[PDB]
Symmetry: D2
Subunit: 240 residues, 4 copies
């Protein structure tokens, strides 16, 4: 009917390969500018990070089949169990339901974390869907993101200390850090600022992992090693 209904023929199938892990990853859009305009503390800002996590919790509570989420900096990844058929496994549905629910929550709960700082404008989020064929590839993905958190936090902590405390210019801080190794960065934090990196808050060092324990609770533990997985076998062991 309608005579215009034929246009439905143009919708294409975007089904995610069956019995595989489906991950939706979100990145705040132009959050470098968003951070500036909202006076985000460098190198880490607890308000921003906890707001993100609160949004991830909401996504996990409102959508379905998400078994684990991992967030750090301006990103959050959501893993849907592989036997899911939530929306016939259509990529577009995973993407938009996660992206929209997250964004609405970001604004909705903003005041709970930024009681004094006013939200200047509704932000946007970049999103993508990736399918991982195995438990090992999924874990490697999560390790990839956690390792990224580590690399960036170490760099940023020493970088901002050089600026905010040593008085160096952004360009000077960068030059001093170029070519430096992990051990070097640690030595600089210790010698020049009397900072023990390993004592920095767990959230800033490892990021945040959300799992069902029922409600999604936050943890700032290592997920690269086996310990985490051996202790929460229900996640990867699930059927299909």
């Amino acid at each position: 009917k309608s005579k215009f209904e034929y246009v439905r023929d143009f919708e294409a199938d975007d089904t995610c390969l069956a019995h595989c892990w489906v991950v939706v990853r979100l990145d705040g859009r132009n959050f470098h500018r968003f951070a500036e305009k909202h006076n985000f503390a460098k190198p880490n800002d607890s308000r921003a990070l906890q707001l993100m996590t609160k949004c991830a919790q909401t996504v996990m509570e409102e959508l379905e089949d998400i078994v684990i989420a991992y967030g750090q900096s301006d990103e959050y990844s959501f893993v849907f169990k592989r036997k899911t058929n939530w929306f016939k496994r259509r990529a577009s549905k995973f993407m938009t339901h996660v992206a929209s629910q997250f964004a609405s929550s970001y604004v909705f709960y903003w005041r709970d974390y930024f009681e004094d700082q006013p939200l200047l404008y509704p932000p946007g989020f970049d999103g993508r869907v990736v399918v991982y064929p195995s438990n090992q590839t999924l874990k490697d993905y999560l390790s990839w993101r956690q390792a990224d958190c580590h690399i960036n936090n170490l760099y940023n902590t020493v970088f901002w200390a050089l600026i905010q405390q040593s008085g160096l210019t952004p360009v000077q801080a960068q030059g001093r850090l170029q070519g430096t190794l992990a051990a070097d960065k640690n030595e600089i934090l210790f010698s020049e600022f009397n900072i023990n990196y390993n004592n920095e808050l767990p959230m800033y060092r490892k990021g945040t992992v959300l799992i069902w324990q029922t409600k999604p609770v936050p943890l700032h533990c290592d997920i690269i090693g086996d310990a985490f997985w051996k202790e929460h076998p229900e996640i990867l062991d699930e059927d299909s």
Copy 2:
């Protein structure tokens, strides 16, 4: 030498066929419940509708290459010009940037339309991407959505009149309307409720179209006929 970086190989290309119209369509998620919980007026609620449009305007102003938007009820469609290469024409990018920016705006500008009614929880939105190969198919798509607005508004107007004014039960209203034709519904509104359907507000009857005139201005005109397109030839005539 990351070692986990190989997981990048899993990202798949979701490029939209070149030189074609790209449409992102959004639908409020479970908005039947959202409407109930927020006391939306039936059959039409100006607050809700105008908030949606405000969101569409924000999406058009913050993203790029959107030449026309059309909304009605709990939906809104965004048309990206066919020569766009905004994000290498990746479907996921169109989807998430539109969905997220729309959702954050929905919460952000809520009070501007629901000054008294409080927002009980951050809503989610359903989204999809469709590629239309020609100007005629794109027009037919828009006509399909506008015709949908007409069909539903006529049905809902008489439906809610039977309930809110005749005292019929939802089930009775439905029974009375089954098998009825468009002319019949019009007759019922006129005879039993002294309602001239054609005099109902334009926004409720035709929905809202957004085009650049620069800023995106709202119009509640017919877009099925040629009149609209002959008057705004810049939209379909653009290169590529």
Copy 3:
């Protein structure tokens, strides 16, 4: 400055999910008619089957990264190792190179198997590509095809015996076999035709597997059990 070159923009990416098994499966097109027209012996014809295998061998020798092939009746499946990047893993390339090389070989080597029977016309082949995320799914796929060979050979052997030896009409044969179980079919072959099914040629019962031993050698063994895989661990154990 060609001016027509822009049509290249329309080519779409059809890359197969990285680090996964890629299978190309071929089916002779309308081979029921081809078999009739070329006097194929029923229920099995060694000429046809061995010609197919010869073709599979040529596909494995001329293309690259194929680690195992399995054929039966009018089909043949080719498995490409998962670390292959042969053609950027484009589905179309796997499909056409396999399909074309197979078809040309079918005609080229025809006389080597049908020395007297003349080829009446060049046949066509149906083809498809499927990506299997794991070793178990790939094995289950091969088992699915071998089991198919078993089910059909048992059915066809008793079916053609009822016709070619009992004088039943095709429709009568079918009626007699409807509702029958595997054991029943075995009983019928034994009692009424003095045929011990398990003694039928291995090729007809299990089909043909091709693996590198270098050249691709034919084997008519079971591949559903673990025996085959434990003995040829190089196939599934390969990197990536």
Copy 4:
């Protein structure tokens, strides 16, 4: 049933955008070597070209919904009408049925064109599927291929004349031709070899077009201009 049947869930949809032109293009695989080994005459070999065309005719006769084919050098393109639903418009089916039927025919009819030259080995063919959204884009595609034929034949004719008649070395011929314009190449053919390019056989200059007139007949006419299309309006005018 089967227990292995679940593997069917892995097959992905590869449907071509509805109501659009579907083109399957084939390129002989490593035909530079094939030409050498079979003593193909340079710059053009009538046997090779006519064999290709014979194969294209067979593809058009055995498959369905192909309305026009265009071939030149070692390639052939097949255009399927846009309202086709032959195989649910699955790319893989267009690809493999065209590639296989073509290849089997190439071998089958080889002797009809190479009566003395023996076929040393069964060749392979590269294949691809492209979807064109409009009549204009389809025509531009065909013009792109015909123009390519022109460009290459002009270059090759003068190139091989320089070698085969002027005694230049391949590397010298190339150097002399670098930087030369169309008019220059024409001047060289005329002045040095007394060759009027425009008098070369139509097949070598324009290639071959196949259309239904019913059977697919060969034509060596221009298809870049409107003349051809105005005279055979049935092709682009067909419904959908």
